[PDB]
Predict the structure of accessory gene regulator protein C.
Amino acid sequence: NAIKLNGIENLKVREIKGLITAKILRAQEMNIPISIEIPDEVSSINLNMIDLSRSIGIILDNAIEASTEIDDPIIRVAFIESENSVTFIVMNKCADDIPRIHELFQESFSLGLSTLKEIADNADNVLLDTIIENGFFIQKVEIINN
Amino acid sequence: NAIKLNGIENLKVREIKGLITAKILRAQEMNIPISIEIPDEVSSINLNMIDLSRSIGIILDNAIEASTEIDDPIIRVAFIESENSVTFIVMNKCADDIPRIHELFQESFSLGLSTLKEIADNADNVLLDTIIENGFFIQKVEIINN
């Protein structure tokens, strides 16, 4: 195993805990090191449980799937509290394997990234970003409080 | 879609709700009808969140995977409250496709059924059963209160 715990107790949205636990253990089943970083307390997220669960599941599954052909994989998972939002961020090491990320897009839009996009498009408080940066694939959902 | 809701509001263990929701929607993504039956209120289960989440995830994934080659699939999911226990039951239609169930066992023991067995073996209040009956594969975890 390799699981780094960095504020797990700060996640106080109970309904997604089992989901996150299950995905983290799946990552481990497949020998992918995983980091969970929650710097501040997160006691509510302004997105309904259905879309929040689905988005978290898809994003973590994307990161796991994208990490299986990688030599020295790692997944970082974060929930970041801002003044007016909560951001869920997952990064996986893709190194130079851009084709793997392209494959993700190909499959989803030829129900992973497409479901995710549909949730974000239908919710005015939800911003979705996808970024390749410094050898990591980054999936980011910011969920605005107002 | 096809999701039959039969006591969803009776599940009051919040920590596994997102997990169950995510798996149900995955089943739907793959065009598998799903029934959720919770006849009585379930406000606690005497198994820690880690093993409970993992077991639910594995069992639902098993049922989904075992349903993909089936002509007219269906998954039934139940939480049953007894005097001294809670039973989590998942049934999927396997019809005559016993080889598919055999494949499940082959793969797990050559981390699905094996992880599940390990959880049950290590917990004296946890009983695991696996049954092929009337064209359904039935996975059953009874979790004793005492």
Observations:
- The beta strands of chain B are 3-6, 34-37, 75-81, 85-93, 126-133, 136-144.
- The interface with chain A takes residues 14-19, 21-22, 25-26, 29, 49-50, 52-54, 56-57, 111, 115 of chain B (CB under 8 Å).
- The helical segments of chain B are 17-29, 49-65, 98-109, 113-122.
- The longest helix of chain B spans residues 49-65.
